[PDB]
Write a protein that holds these residues in place. Structure first.
Motif, PDB file in Angstrom:
ATOM      1  N   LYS A 117     -25.043  10.333 -24.734  1.00  0.00           N
ATOM      2  CA  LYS A 117     -25.097   9.053 -25.117  1.00  0.00           C
ATOM      3  C   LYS A 117     -24.764   8.398 -26.416  1.00  0.00           C
ATOM      4  N   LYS A 118     -23.832   7.473 -26.514  1.00  0.00           N
ATOM      5  CA  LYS A 118     -23.323   7.047 -27.826  1.00  0.00           C
ATOM      6  C   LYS A 118     -23.627   5.592 -27.976  1.00  0.00           C
ATOM      7  N   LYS A 119     -24.163   5.330 -29.172  1.00  0.00           N
ATOM      8  CA  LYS A 119     -24.581   3.843 -29.643  1.00  0.00           C
ATOM      9  C   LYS A 119     -23.606   2.819 -29.701  1.00  0.00           C
ATOM     10  N   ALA A 120     -23.516   1.811 -28.877  1.00  0.00           N
ATOM     11  CA  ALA A 120     -22.452   0.885 -28.945  1.00  0.00           C
ATOM     12  C   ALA A 120     -22.757  -0.201 -30.115  1.00  0.00           C
ATOM     13  N   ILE A 121     -21.843  -0.427 -30.744  1.00  0.00           N
ATOM     14  CA  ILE A 121     -21.785  -1.426 -31.900  1.00  0.00           C
ATOM     15  C   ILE A 121     -20.633  -2.370 -32.006  1.00  0.00           C
ATOM     16  N   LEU A 122     -20.709  -3.315 -32.938  1.00  0.00           N
ATOM     17  CA  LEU A 122     -19.784  -4.119 -33.241  1.00  0.00           C
ATOM     18  C   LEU A 122     -19.024  -3.938 -34.743  1.00  0.00           C
ATOM     19  N   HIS A 123     -17.802  -3.455 -34.583  1.00  0.00           N
ATOM     20  CA  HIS A 123     -17.165  -3.494 -35.907  1.00  0.00           C
ATOM     21  C   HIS A 123     -15.993  -4.027 -36.274  1.00  0.00           C
ATOM     22  N   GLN A 124     -15.485  -4.086 -37.477  1.00  0.00           N
ATOM     23  CA  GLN A 124     -14.395  -4.864 -37.956  1.00  0.00           C
ATOM     24  C   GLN A 124     -13.180  -4.248 -37.353  1.00  0.00           C
ATOM     25  N   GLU A 125     -12.917  -2.970 -37.250  1.00  0.00           N
ATOM     26  CA  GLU A 125     -11.810  -2.216 -36.831  1.00  0.00           C
ATOM     27  C   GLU A 125     -12.358  -1.424 -35.502  1.00  0.00           C
ATOM     28  N   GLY A 126     -13.145  -0.667 -35.318  1.00  0.00           N
ATOM     29  CA  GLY A 126     -13.432   0.202 -34.281  1.00  0.00           C
ATOM     30  C   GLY A 126     -12.479   1.127 -33.822  1.00  0.00           C
ATOM     31  N   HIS A 127     -12.163   1.326 -32.555  1.00  0.00           N
ATOM     32  CA  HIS A 127     -11.393   2.456 -32.391  1.00  0.00           C
ATOM     33  C   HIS A 127     -10.292   2.288 -31.200  1.00  0.00           C
ATOM     34  N   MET A 128      -9.129   3.308 -31.331  1.00  0.00           N
ATOM     35  CA  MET A 128      -8.306   3.294 -30.286  1.00  0.00           C
ATOM     36  C   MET A 128      -8.643   2.987 -28.714  1.00  0.00           C
ATOM     37  N   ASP A 129      -9.632   3.812 -28.312  1.00  0.00           N
ATOM     38  CA  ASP A 129     -10.232   3.888 -27.200  1.00  0.00           C
ATOM     39  C   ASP A 129     -11.452   2.787 -26.668  1.00  0.00           C
ATOM     40  N   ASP A 130     -11.552   1.841 -27.405  1.00  0.00           N
ATOM     41  CA  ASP A 130     -12.414   0.713 -27.219  1.00  0.00           C
ATOM     42  C   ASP A 130     -12.335  -0.192 -25.777  1.00  0.00           C
ATOM     43  N   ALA A 131     -11.159  -0.179 -25.301  1.00  0.00           N
ATOM     44  CA  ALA A 131     -10.926  -0.956 -24.092  1.00  0.00           C
ATOM     45  C   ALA A 131     -11.760  -0.326 -22.911  1.00  0.00           C
ATOM     46  N   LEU A 132     -12.296  -1.479 -22.023  1.00  0.00           N
ATOM     47  CA  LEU A 132     -13.179  -1.134 -20.967  1.00  0.00           C
ATOM     48  C   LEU A 132     -12.438  -1.610 -19.698  1.00  0.00           C
ATOM     49  N   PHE A 133     -12.601  -0.841 -18.726  1.00  0.00           N
ATOM     50  CA  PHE A 133     -12.188  -1.274 -17.346  1.00  0.00           C
ATOM     51  C   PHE A 133     -13.602  -2.008 -16.441  1.00  0.00           C
ATOM     52  N   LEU A 134     -13.336  -3.249 -16.200  1.00  0.00           N
ATOM     53  CA  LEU A 134     -14.283  -3.912 -15.379  1.00  0.00           C
ATOM     54  C   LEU A 134     -14.463  -3.480 -14.071  1.00  0.00           C
ATOM     55  N   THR A 135     -15.527  -3.217 -13.711  1.00  0.00           N
ATOM     56  CA  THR A 135     -15.759  -2.437 -12.312  1.00  0.00           C
ATOM     57  C   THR A 135     -16.585  -2.800 -11.381  1.00  0.00           C
ATOM     58  N   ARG A 136     -15.986  -3.051 -10.323  1.00  0.00           N
ATOM     59  CA  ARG A 136     -16.929  -3.969  -9.138  1.00  0.00           C
ATOM     60  C   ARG A 136     -18.077  -2.682  -8.852  1.00  0.00           C
ATOM     61  N   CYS A 137     -19.126  -3.289  -8.559  1.00  0.00           N
ATOM     62  CA  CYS A 137     -20.034  -2.391  -7.899  1.00  0.00           C
ATOM     63  C   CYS A 137     -20.208  -2.554  -6.276  1.00  0.00           C
ATOM     64  N   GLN A 138     -21.192  -1.691  -5.813  1.00  0.00           N
ATOM     65  CA  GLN A 138     -21.691  -1.794  -4.349  1.00  0.00           C
ATOM     66  C   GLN A 138     -22.543  -3.033  -4.162  1.00  0.00           C
ATOM     67  N   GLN A 139     -22.553  -3.935  -3.152  1.00  0.00           N
ATOM     68  CA  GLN A 139     -23.388  -4.900  -2.827  1.00  0.00           C
ATOM     69  C   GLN A 139     -24.661  -4.570  -2.908  1.00  0.00           C
ATOM     70  N   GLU A 140     -24.979  -3.223  -2.164  1.00  0.00           N
ATOM     71  CA  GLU A 140     -26.327  -2.775  -2.246  1.00  0.00           C
ATOM     72  C   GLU A 140     -26.994  -2.567  -3.720  1.00  0.00           C
ATOM     73  N   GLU A 141     -26.338  -1.983  -4.629  1.00  0.00           N
ATOM     74  CA  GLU A 141     -26.702  -2.126  -6.097  1.00  0.00           C
ATOM     75  C   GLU A 141     -26.853  -3.246  -6.559  1.00  0.00           C
ATOM     76  N   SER A 142     -25.977  -4.550  -6.241  1.00  0.00           N
ATOM     77  CA  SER A 142     -26.120  -5.806  -6.984  1.00  0.00           C
ATOM     78  C   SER A 142     -27.320  -6.204  -6.200  1.00  0.00           C
ATOM     79  N   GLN A 143     -27.460  -6.171  -5.166  1.00  0.00           N
ATOM     80  CA  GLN A 143     -28.681  -6.791  -4.236  1.00  0.00           C
ATOM     81  C   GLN A 143     -29.994  -6.251  -5.169  1.00  0.00           C
ATOM     82  N   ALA A 144     -29.898  -4.955  -5.096  1.00  0.00           N
ATOM     83  CA  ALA A 144     -31.043  -4.229  -5.771  1.00  0.00           C
ATOM     84  C   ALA A 144     -31.454  -4.581  -7.134  1.00  0.00           C
ATOM     85  N   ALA A 145     -30.460  -4.602  -8.131  1.00  0.00           N
ATOM     86  CA  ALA A 145     -30.465  -4.997  -9.465  1.00  0.00           C
ATOM     87  C   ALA A 145     -31.085  -6.675  -9.582  1.00  0.00           C
ATOM     88  N   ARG A 146     -30.485  -7.717  -8.715  1.00  0.00           N
ATOM     89  CA  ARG A 146     -31.160  -8.939  -8.653  1.00  0.00           C
ATOM     90  C   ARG A 146     -32.622  -8.906  -8.066  1.00  0.00           C
TER      91      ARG A 146
END
Length: 259
Positions: A117-146
């Motif tokens: 685990k690495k702690k997420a922050i807000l930085h002025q410059e940050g890093h090369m590899d900051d870019a995130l993929f938005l990833t759909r999850c299963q219906q079952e997971e979202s039903q359960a989360a809700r």
């Protein structure tokens, strides 16, 4: 909008139930979380650059910048536009599709980049590899989360309810009874494919500490020997539902553990 995970090219997540950080901090983590409800988020527009809030699903807290803690996850009541508004950006200089677009996450008011685990922050410059993929999850997971969010919200209302008159001679009795009944049915055994699904939903709930939650209700109601005893503190009207609520609570607990 849609409930999703946010991945590095490991994913974006808060700590597990009953953690010393009080679930306010945000991390990037790999392994088990990728399948668990704590790493699920919903995007709530107020397309590239378009301002939006990022809500944590099971806790209903909102991603935000604080002077005092920087990047944290904040109660809906303190989630004002300046604090909680982000956008996605293609690059870091000065439309969107799941699992294809690499998304830099920026805080609108400050211009800060979401980074580490690495702690997420807000930085002025940050890093090369900051870019995130938005990833759909299963219906079952979202039903359960809700459901986990809803039920937690409800049982805590019920618990705060019991606490008010603990030692002192309006509770959501109907909502609670209804909620137990629904969850008991939700966890009903069925075939092999339905069995895998059930074990998975149990698990998702166990990791969000739902056993603890149900037991916290059982413990607070078991302080009373009878409906009559309960009546002296709660309503005489609420005491009519005492035995039944503790039976359903024991039933939900059994239901979470079984097979």
């Amino acid at each position: 909008g849609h409930v999703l995970r946010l991945f590095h090219g490991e994913c974006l997540t808060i700590s597990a139930a009953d953690s010393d950080d009080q679930r306010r901090l945000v991390y990037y983590e790999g392994g088990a979380v990728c399948t668990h409800a704590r790493s699920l988020w919903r995007l709530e527009p107020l397309r590239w650059g378009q301002p939006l809030r990022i809500r944590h699903v099971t806790t209903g807290r909102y991603l935000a910048l604080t002077e005092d803690q920087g990047l944290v996850v904040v109660d809906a009541c303190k989630a004002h536009t300046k604090a909680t508004s982000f956008c996605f950006r293609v690059s870091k200089e000065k439309e969107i599709k799941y699992g294809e677009s690499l998304c830099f996450v920026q805080h609108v008011a400050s211009g800060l980049w979401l980074t580490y685990k690495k702690k997420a922050i807000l930085h002025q410059e940050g890093h090369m590899d900051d870019a995130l993929f938005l990833t759909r999850c299963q219906q079952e997971e979202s039903q359960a989360a809700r459901m986990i969010h809803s039920t937690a919200g409800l049982y805590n209302q019920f618990i705060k309810g019991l606490d008010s008159f603990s030692g002192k001679p309006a509770l959501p009795i109907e909502a609670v009874i209804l909620s137990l009944q629904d969850l008991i049915g939700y966890f009903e055994p069925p075939k092999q494919s339905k069995l895998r699904s059930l074990r998975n939903r149990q698990s998702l709930f166990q990791e969000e500490g739902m056993l603890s939650l149900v037991l916290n209700c059982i413990d607070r109601l078991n302080v009373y020997t009878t409906a009559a005893h309960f009546a002296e503190y709660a309503g005489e009207e609420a005491a009519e539902s005492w035995k039944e609520i503790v039976n359903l609570l024991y039933e939900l607990l059994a239901s979470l553990i079984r097979g």
